[PDB]
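Inputs:
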Amino acid sequence: GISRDSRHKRSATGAKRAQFRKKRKFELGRQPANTKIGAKRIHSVRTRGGNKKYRALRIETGNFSWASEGISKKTRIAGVVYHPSNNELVRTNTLTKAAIVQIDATPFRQWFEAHYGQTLGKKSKNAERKWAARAASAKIESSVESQFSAGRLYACISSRPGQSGRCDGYILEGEELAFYLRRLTAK
Amino acid sequence: ELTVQSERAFQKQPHIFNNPKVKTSKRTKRWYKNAGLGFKTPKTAIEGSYIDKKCPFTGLVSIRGKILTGTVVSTKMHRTIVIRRAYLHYIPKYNRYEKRHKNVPVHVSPAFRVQVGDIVTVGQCRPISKTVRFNVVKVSAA
Amino acid sequence: PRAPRTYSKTYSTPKRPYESSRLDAELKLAGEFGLKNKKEIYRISFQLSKIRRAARDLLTRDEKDPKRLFEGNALIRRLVRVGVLSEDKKKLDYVLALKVEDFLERRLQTQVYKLGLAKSVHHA
Amino acid sequence: ARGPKKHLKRLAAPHHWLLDKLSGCYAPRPSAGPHKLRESLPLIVFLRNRLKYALNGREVKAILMQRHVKVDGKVRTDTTYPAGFMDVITLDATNENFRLVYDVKGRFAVHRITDEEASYKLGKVKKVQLGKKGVPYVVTHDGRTIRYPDPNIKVNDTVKIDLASGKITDFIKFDAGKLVYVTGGRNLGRIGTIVHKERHDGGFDLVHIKDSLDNTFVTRLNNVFVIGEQGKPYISLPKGKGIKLSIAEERDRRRAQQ
RNA sequence: GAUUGACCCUU
RNA sequence: CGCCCGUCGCUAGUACCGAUUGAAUGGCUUAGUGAGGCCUCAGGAUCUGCUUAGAGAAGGGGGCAACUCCAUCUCAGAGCGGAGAAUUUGGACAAACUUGGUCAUUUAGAGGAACUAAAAGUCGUAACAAGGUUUCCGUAGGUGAACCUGCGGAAGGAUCAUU
RNA sequence: ACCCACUCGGCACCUUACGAGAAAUCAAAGUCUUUGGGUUCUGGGGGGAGUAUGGUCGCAAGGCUGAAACUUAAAGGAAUU
RNA sequence: GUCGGAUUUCCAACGGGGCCUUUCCUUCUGGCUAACCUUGAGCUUGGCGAACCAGGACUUUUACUUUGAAAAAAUUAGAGUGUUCAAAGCAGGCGUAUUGCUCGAAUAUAUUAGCAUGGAAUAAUAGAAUAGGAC
RNA sequence: UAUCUGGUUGAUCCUGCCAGUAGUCAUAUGCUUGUCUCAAAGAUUAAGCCAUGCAUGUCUAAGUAUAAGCAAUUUAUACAGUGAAACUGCGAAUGGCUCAUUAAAUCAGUUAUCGUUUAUUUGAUAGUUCCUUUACUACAUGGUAUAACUGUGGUAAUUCUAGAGCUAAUACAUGCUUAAAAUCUCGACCCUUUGGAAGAGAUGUAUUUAUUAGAUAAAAAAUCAAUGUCUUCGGACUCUUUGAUGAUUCAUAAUAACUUUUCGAAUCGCAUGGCCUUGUGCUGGCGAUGGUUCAUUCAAAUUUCUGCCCUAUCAACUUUCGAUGGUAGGAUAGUGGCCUACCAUGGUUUCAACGGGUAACGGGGAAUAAGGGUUCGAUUCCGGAGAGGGAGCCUGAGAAACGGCUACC
RNA sequence: UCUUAAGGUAGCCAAAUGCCUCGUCAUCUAAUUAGUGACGCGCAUGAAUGGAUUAACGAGAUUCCCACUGUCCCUAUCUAC
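Outputs:
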């Protein structure tokens, strides 16, 4: 029953607009997804001209991208930690866009070991040569190493789960890291 | 706006990714654009630190349609101001005019510094808020 | 539904209902031209006023105006087609001063009496 | 409201159909097709009024579904198929081909041509893009898409297409000193031999257009349409050659060749 | 400088 | 012998006020209820398919008689996709109602008070002449009624005038 | 200090009309059907009525704003005989 | 000169394109190579731009005022039109009459508004003054 | 047709109204009413209430016909039907009607979508794939069952209907045949530093998360962490273009590359031309549409700029959390306080906001003037709204649809 | 005119003052000698023997409404003494 017009709102001067039309099909709204973690459940809704929209509810796994390393993998989420919109969303551990979640980083660790060969936290000659050639660029900074030792990476979801049914995101690196981590440690 | 990260969210231009690998001059990237229609992009918009997703140059809005001008009457609103558009409305029966005006609210990018009484020109963009539909492109008064 | 069909009046009543001179003139005109009503006189006066207004609005425009020349040529062409204006004088005085008497004396009913086919206006 | 209209009232159709406002409460609504609703001439009116070969709608439908008509070389068995401008209507019966072009005064006139001319048609491109599979293409005024055009064809240029295959037989660029055919506004139906155009950064470019008699006007770029080079045109033009001779001249030549 | 208050019918 | 004013008396009409927590209609509502549809964790049918061990049965088969009875149909126990019609966890849209807060809105009302009208009512004679106390204005008081009086003002005065 | 030319700014006066006006009369009430220097306020037949009602100011008396219903063919302006 | 479209000494006038009168149609780099310093015995190899294009710049701002989509449809009078004339619709008209052909249904935009364009009269806070004015 | 006349007085000049006069595609009414054409016609009060009858259903040669429907052809036992019905499709969202609401709201002209959807329509055909991967299966081909056909369910009843013997899908999932260049990779070796023969996965978009080719206008100087075109170590690097508009993160594709996998024809009609190591095999045309999909349009939604009658006996209006903009999110088809968390009294206003009234739908548009125009516009055309009022929704490209459903008076 | 000097003015009223009287009309109720508002020839209202009105106040008198309840329908049970 949610509507999406402006005729129900007060005019820019503050005048109460009169009732002009009934609520219209082309300006409707729908209930929030409030998608959660675990037991992936996607519901399909038929919209204007077909155009199936995948409303996510209790998603489980998502596709996260390390932009610097130019990699992307599927990975399960460990829960949200900070939300610019609302802290109640953080408490409810719900999923929305631009939400900061934790990931277990296991596929990323496996990619790092398979592609660079540097140990984290604690063989053919040709493959060793290739790894040594790709090496000498495994020293980005200290927080990434600390997070990978911890086994939980901080990443923000860039997708719209209630629009596409996918909780796709990217891992924080650089100034967004240096901002969100100081925000979390600031208490 | 002394601090560009005074908000809860991290203010960053979409899809402008700065590689941390290099350590040289200009370690961070800024995205601007030519607004078009002959309006020059200020060096402040070129080299600033603000984000302002609604900026004509450093934002994602495209300026198209009407191009208006007027003197600002209120600047007490964040990133948006109201200009006064004075005009004369013709009345055939009496064969003369009457002073009329219309306060239109427009969005002011942090590239421009404006104050009450300044004449600014604005260009139409997509609806930015409930009332704002124009973005300032030049300040023409001191 | 269907497009409307336009209909226009063809006559006009005098502004003063009882003018002795006008009543005498109209009765004499209708008696000498064999008319059944003053509505015929009203119709002919209506078209006379229409064409006089047309001529005045034509003279409104500047001399050597294309619209003025065309519209005056059309009006004079129709006037000479009905046969009232001179075939060798383009002086337009008759155009500005056509008369109800001219229009009725050009009308058909009196044409028979003029050419001598009935010898009486009412018999015609 | 609530969905696209299917009916068309009389007095709401474009005036250049030369319809009669009486004798019927409705007008034949053009269907979606190659041209716009307003600047199109449906086969029903073309066969009932321009040609009189069909007296009413039942006969019009009889012709089209009896398959005596092909539009642009294709039958197009639709009673109100939108037949717009520059398109060729071929009738194997009577072996007669028409090119739908505006007359001097902007009404789609009957323009009989031969098989050689009816083979092809001209069309101004609408835009040049890079469609799917990375294939460059041009979308023209006819709703036609031409695949793999040469890099030099740009906007507002026109293409002459053989109408049988996808080959680009010829094209005419857009530049000063080029003959055009103005389609829209007061000047629907005039021949151009243009001189220059005003840019006016922001939209609505205009071109200055002087006919043979040194009569010069202005017409929007979206309203201009080039149909050949200077001198010889790429198609044949109907009677009067579309020069807009004033009404005094009209009566002059009528009373001359009465 | 007193007391003189009033007078039903048409252009 | 003109004209003319007001009270009072008769007749009708008009609007106004009016106790009646007057009443009847549509808008937003501090608060409190709340039908139906729509978004959401969970209980119940059925046909489908893979398999090694338990029954009744349309030719017990390698020595035709102690051992495998043939996927041939029947029966309970092992693993899964199509109905989420009985509630609802959380909700949102939101029909339908109170004591109280308005719309020159509409409308009833005992009674009160004023105005308006026509040929012939009573009482006076206030004004029009210096109208017999010049008239009139503001204000205040008084009085059957016009009106009278005080105070200030005006001339539209009955003086355009003093030596 | 008066007496005489005489500028300037005031209160006013004295004879047709240049003009205005319905006239009385008016050097403005003129320069307005040969109609526009700028600007404010007010009126739209007589009454009902400066009433009712709602505001608002007032101690009050009352002041300011302020109608309709209804009634009416005149009411008025200059004294021409 | 063609039995009133025929215009040379046309010396009776003009917004606008050029020159002198202190009175110029925006940088600086280029492509056709910019109103041309460049005679091939009779439509040219390099000095300068805006009358198309490139990028920074200004009609600091108007009001005002001629030129084109602008009131999408019938009207305004019609080259013309016999519905019994006419109101009306757009019809209609002519063959060596067995053939057949064809003109035409356009012209005013119904305030204000937004567009592009020429103009400068009619009214300026704006410049540069306790110079953080111009090459 | 730029016009006036009677009424105040004994008479006179005047402001001043009353009355007269003439129009009304304004209405009603009275009397009368013979012909020719088009003719408005329950608008005004009650967008009051409605008996009845009708007003949206519809198929071809080309989805299904095996109906105790029908008349049946023959030098073919090698496939001619019509067709009262009912399932899949499409429409029923167009028409037509009425002005109730609605006074910056509709609407008119002009803008914009570089801020979005769009069934049919047109131009356009989709080879990259066995995601337990040199076999877990049918490509001269699939799997599931309610629709038809025969008795029964209630009284006065309705467009109410159930469990049986069956049936192909264009009703619903899975699947496949192309040995046409090439990158990223796993890896027997000489024991590095111009290196090279072997076997296999991705290369269409639906999520848009990383760089780009996505540049664009002039002459000299070399030692790099990580070698390209190059081949007379003194033989050069010029070829790094796949783009119009004023403007873009706009318009392809690659090293990353997800999913509950809509899809990449398990479709119907019409005359058989050619190949044979001779089959109920192989090759070749004319017609219909779901479906990656890309572009005016029929379209819709938002959307600039200016303009709307009366009223100040309406001067301040907009509120715990929308009235203000900003940041992030959700929802939308999409922008946007359309809504959610934090941050101000921000926004409008005598140039009249806000409030009230309208016997107010708006515009095109009748009645007069070369300019005084004042009214009216329910009504034939366009844009709105509504289907007794409010609210909610399914299907559908399109509906808040009311001759579609779900709830009172 | 007469008694006896004047004849009840402004106001107010079946009033805490009106016998007739449970006055008449309206309203309030299903029904009202009650209440309130009107009307007054008022047995016998009335002007510092003060008239009329009046905000606030009242263990003053009276009417109605909401809430509340064992007053009541219609009673029952429990505790202490």
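Remarks. Residues 121-171 of chain D form one domain. The first strand of chain D starts at residue 41 and ends at 42.
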